Amino acid sequence: AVYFLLLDLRAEVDEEIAWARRLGLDDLVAALEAVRALIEGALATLESADFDYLEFTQRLADALSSLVRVYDDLIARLEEQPATTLRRAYRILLEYRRKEVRELLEAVQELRDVLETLERLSRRLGRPDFAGWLVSFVLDHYGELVAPDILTNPAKGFRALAHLLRAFLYVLLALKLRSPDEELREEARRAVAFLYGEEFVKAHSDEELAELLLERAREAILEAARYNSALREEFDAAGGPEGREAWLERQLLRLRGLVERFLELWENSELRAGPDGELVAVPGVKGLEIIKKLLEEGKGVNLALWTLGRLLRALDLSPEARAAYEAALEALRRARLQLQYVQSERYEGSDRERAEAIRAAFETIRAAAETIRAVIEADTSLPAELKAAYIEVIYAYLLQVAREVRDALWRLAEEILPEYIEKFFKGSEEEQRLTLYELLRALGEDYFFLDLEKEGYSEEELRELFRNAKLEVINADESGKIKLYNLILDAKKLNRKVLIKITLTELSEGSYIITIEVFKSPDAEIPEYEIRVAAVGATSEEILKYLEELKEKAKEGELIRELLLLYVDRQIAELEEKVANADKIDPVVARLAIEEARARGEELTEADVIEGTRAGYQAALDVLRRIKAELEKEKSPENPFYQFYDKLTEKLKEKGFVSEEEAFEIARETFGFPADLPPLAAAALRDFASTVLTILEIFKTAEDFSKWYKENKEKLIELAGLSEEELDKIVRKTLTLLLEALARSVFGSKLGRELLNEALGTFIKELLESFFRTHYGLTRGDAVIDFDAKTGILSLRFTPRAYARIRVKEYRDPSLGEKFDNLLDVLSSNPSLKGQVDRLRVSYAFGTPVGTTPALRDATAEDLETDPRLKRHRDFIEEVENLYAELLIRLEEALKDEPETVEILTEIIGRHLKEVIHDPDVINALLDRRDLSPEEFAARARAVLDEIIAEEKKLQEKLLEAVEDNPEAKKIVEEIFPKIIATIERYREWPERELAGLPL
């Protein structure tokens, strides 16, 4: 985000102020405090009720420019006046920091230029607010792509955003040129004339202009792919000019669809007179419907907040009401940022405080939303339909916030539950109902509460309704291990009943397993609401025994049968719901289908396409119902499903890894389906096979984890630096996630795979973080772990100071490296962690992300011992790093009287290592050689090595000038640096003929 970037800038300014105070420069603390004030002003303008993109970028650019000027003044004061060793070391560090800040400022200025161009273009056309809507739409549809870069490397994110905005504008103009409407063509012609001049537009036809603008869009998309990490990885994953052209065509098609949707949204908005007479645009019914559909899918928060702000600025109200609404919007934005803060890793409080803060933030958001709702309802200047659309948008936003809060509270359920568990086992019937109500409130079933509150039910009415509900307890067995409680909640106005089932499996005294299931109706078998499973106060051994018992019980095929029946019933209900809306076909979707059908050169009416789609849907529904009827049949040796399941189990036992395609082929062969089936039936069969495979893999993973943990508990305790409680807690979290995945697999294979990968990644991440924090004493923020659940990719980062300190400690004692290798081997002994462990091994060995280098994507931990070139590169890096570690230790010994000086030297050398050697360009040049002649590759490698030598010489000159006063430091530098130069030259001067590895 931008909040964390501004926080980091403010922290850097504070450190700068402290260092300035230390050295005695009291004449620049005023300028540094002014810079801090500017940064605080930017932080405040994020959270305001009149947030503007151009103004915010201008403020950020001004703050960065002021910081650069202050760095210039500090450096000038440092050289021009007499100085000592500490001052010159701080001088070099200041130069590095100023370089970084200047690069970030250049990126921000580029983004500001793009926004200014859009602003001027919108202003000339006479239709203001165009830039705001365009930027909000682009942000909504590309935040998930841009935000990670801003988190890691802000300049790349800013440049990618600018290029994507340019591409969006060009595609929009190209589409507007070819519109049949004359006014739209005239407006697009005016825009093109403004962009390129009267002469360029007066000598070209419309189709030529459209093609030129589409080519410009292609160039902008290519630039964005160049400057964006995810897009670059996707671009390199294709390979071949044909694949690249296909990728560009798909990108253009997606962008064209987005631009058509934006045009549909924009063409409905109309001008309404503002308080000062300025013409301001507010969306119609269809625009708000589009925004609500976006909000129901997890997007559209930017567009909704901008819509509310524009409604604020487009209404005439009394001063008190307008002030209240503005304050409500300010509080909404502030509490949103606070919630993102508390859910992050920067929070340092305990679990109870975290849950309390989450609840308080949600309460503030809800109160602000209620105030906005009351302000909207009080005004009577709008028709009923628009008001209803606005209230529905607010409802959707609050529902999304409620879902996030509920997920966080269910994550903290392990700490929330035990008090309510004891009270619920230690109470009477009325006390049981009170405990159930309070437990449901604490876990935040705010989605269901909001669904109740849609009709306007009050809190007191809800409390009375819950107090008058009917509760009955069922004893499954005489031993009383499993207890089932059924609760009925009825709605008088909606004429609906809600069923809640809670199962309490009492493993022992103080250990329980809770499964909370909510049904839309008691007569409906499919749970519309999710099924949640949590473990409270149960040790790892008890959970593992429970999992083994569950697998044994499901071996006979009952639980799997019920799960598959639930999944099939949900699929059938979804298909019926989709079919029932055949008369409500979206005109845009129908137009797209017609265009795609007619693009093949065949003049075919829509009737044939509709008939084909209906036949495909009918075939899919028929085969799904055939499968459902087959499942409901009694168990028999002649049942094909049992034979298919047995064959799949045997294949998993023997091989251990069967792809979804192979399972689908086996299912088709067993059922004998024709090869020329419609795509929908094949897709449904593939989904069924994927779900079965996912459940079988979950069971196999549980068994393997049980075995491996039972064998390596002691080794994990010894190596990870964990006590019994810590490792027990980690394993409890992993096994609870596994149980939740097994229970939620009925929603599809995607969710099950996501949750399984999340569990394994969390386990590995916690183990690694504990190992680093224990054996190196690093601060909690020095070593960070980034994990993506969607792709299952695990990374590693180190701050330059932490990296240099790690290298120094490892040089002082190799036992830390031996311990890390032993821990990685022990983790890799698990069959279910081998791939991630190998990828992490490669990433740690090279220090750069695997995605950035396509050559290392397929490399495993074994490949580092087979390819001579890879081992040569690794040895080069190891030798250089050892040389710098030796230099750092020698300089620390020679300057034992100045801890600050050695600290700053450590920072300098860490930054040098990060910037010069570990940049991905060198690795790409020296490893990636696809479709290049040998002479050009050799010349490029020699150029890179010469650049490295030049940078090393420059650093040598800087350091030698820095410590000219101290003799011992001079001798140490003169002894060490020529060794690095000679090593790099020897690596360069040695011919690469033998390292090529070409067979004779």
Task: Give yes or no for a contact between 959 and 85, defined as CB atoms under 8 angstroms apart.
Answer: no
Task: Give yes or no for a contact between 841 and 824, defined as CB atoms under 8 angstroms apart.
Answer: yes
CB atoms within 10 A of CB 243: 12
Whole-angstrom distance, CA of residue 591 vs CA of residue 808: 65
Whole-angstrom distance, CA of residue 905 vs CA of residue 954: 16
Which two tokens mark 855? 């050559």
Nearest to 990 by CA among 947, 942, 949, 920: 942
Cα of first residue to Cα of last residue in the chain, in angstroms, is: 54
Task: Give yes or no for a contact between 129 and 122, defined as CB atoms under 8 angstroms apart.
Answer: yes
Quick one: resolution in A? Answer: 3.4
**What 3-state class would DSSP assign to 858?**
coil
**Residue 191: CB partners within 8 Å, gap ≥ 6?**
121, 124, 125, 173, 176
Residue 677, phi-psi category: left (phi > 0), alpha (psi -120 to 50), beta (remainder): beta
Which two tokens mark 729? 């807690």
Angle at 643 between CA 639 and CA 645, to 5 degrees: 115
> Quick one: how far is CA 243 from the chain centroid?
27
Whole-angstrom distance, CA of residue 312 vs CA of residue 323: 10
Whole-angstrom distance, CA of residue 127 vs CA of residue 563: 56
Q: What is the residue whose two structure tokens read 């990644």?
A: 761
DSSP secondary structure code for residue 279 in this structure: E
Task: Give yes or no for a contact between 93 and 61, defined as CB atoms under 8 angstroms apart.
Answer: no
DSSP secondary structure code for residue 517 in this structure: E
Q: Angle, nearest 10°, between helix axes 640-654 and 679-720?
A: 40
Task: Give yes or no for a contact between 667 and 660, defined as CB atoms under 8 angstroms apart.
Answer: no
Give φ, ψ of 524 to 5 degrees: -100, 120
CB atoms within 10 A of CB 802: 20
Angle at 636 between CA 633 and CA 640, to 5 degrees: 75
**What 3-state class would DSSP assign to 484?**
strand
Which two tokens mark 628? 């459902």
Whole-angstrom distance, CA of residue 164 vs CA of residue 222: 10
Whole-angstrom distance, CA of residue 232 vs CA of residue 236: 6
DSSP assignment of 54-108, as one string? HHHHHHHHHHHHHHHHHHHHHHHHHHHS---HHHHHHHHHHHHHHHHHHHHHHHH
Q: What is the 3-state secondary structure (H, E, C) of 324-380?
A: HHHHHHHHHHHHHHHHHHHCCCCCCCCHHHHHHHHHHHHHHHHHHHHHHHHHHHHCC
Angle at 672 between CA 668 and CA 673, to 5 degrees: 70
Residue 687, phi-psi category: left (phi > 0), alpha (psi -120 to 50), beta (remainder): alpha
Partner residues linked to 475 by β-bridges: 483
Partner residues linked to 501 by β-bridges: 486, 517
Q: What is the residue whose two structure tokens read 């044994």?
A: 552
CA–CA distances in Å: residue 487 to residues 472, 561, 637: 7, 26, 40
Which two tokens mark 553? 């019980």
**Residue 493 exposed, middle or buried by CB count within 10 Å (0-12, 13-18, 19+):** exposed
Give φ, ψ of 978 to 5 degrees: -55, -30
Q: What is the residue whose two structure tokens read 């509900």?
A: 469
Q: What is the residue whose two structure tokens read 């224990």?
A: 774
> Which H or E run includes 502?
strand 496-508
Breaks (C-N over 2.5 A) in the chain follow: none
Q: What is the 3-state secondary structure (H, E, C) of 209-264?
A: HHHHHHHHHHHHHHHHHHHCHHHHHHHHHHCCHHHHHHHHHHHHHHHHHHHHHHHH
Angle at 354 between CA 348 and CA 357, to 5 degrees: 115
> Which H or E run includes 730?
helix 724-744
Whole-angstrom distance, CA of residue 727 vs CA of residue 375: 52
Task: Give yes or no for a contact between 78 and 890, defined as CB atoms under 8 angstroms apart.
Answer: no
Nearest to 840 by CA among 831, 825, 855, 803: 825
**Residue 305: CB partners within 8 Å, gap ≥ 6?**
332, 333
**What 3-state class would DSSP assign to 625?**
helix
Which two tokens mark 37? 């004030």
**Residue 535 exposed, middle or buried by CB count within 10 Å (0-12, 13-18, 19+):** buried
Task: Give yes or no for a contact between 198 and 262, defined as CB atoms under 8 angstroms apart.
Answer: no
DSSP assignment of 540-594, as one string? HHHHHHHHHHHHHHHHTSSHHHHHHHHHHHHHHHHHHHHHHTGGG--HHHHHHHH
Task: Give yes or no for a contact between 140 and 303, defined as CB atoms under 8 angstroms apart.
Answer: yes
Nearest to 452 by CA among 468, 463, 442: 463
Whole-angstrom distance, CA of residue 9 vs CA of residue 15: 10
Whole-angstrom distance, CA of residue 908 vs CA of residue 693: 52
Whole-angstrom distance, CA of residue 962 vs CA of residue 904: 12
* CB environment 389-418: b (16+ within 10 A), e (fewer): bbebbbbbbbbbbbeebbebbbbbbbebbe
Partner residues linked to 788 by β-bridges: 793
DSSP secondary structure code for residue 457 in this structure: -
**Residue 192: CB partners within 8 Å, gap ≥ 6?**
173, 177, 200, 201, 209, 213
Whole-angstrom distance, CA of residue 471 vs CA of residue 432: 9
Whole-angstrom distance, CA of residue 3 vs CA of residue 871: 42
Whole-angstrom distance, CA of residue 362 vs CA of residue 304: 18
Q: Virtual CA dihedral for 775, 776, 780, 783, nearest 10 degrees?
A: -110
Whole-angstrom distance, CA of residue 969 vs CA of residue 85: 10
Whole-angstrom distance, CA of residue 450 vs CA of residue 403: 11
| Technique of determination | cryo-EM
Whole-angstrom distance, CA of residue 950 vs CA of residue 967: 25
**Residue 340 exposed, middle or buried by CB count within 10 Å (0-12, 13-18, 19+):** middle
Which two tokens mark 584? 């409500």
Pairing of strands 496-508, 511-519: antiparallel
Angle at 289 between CA 284 and CA 295, to 5 degrees: 130
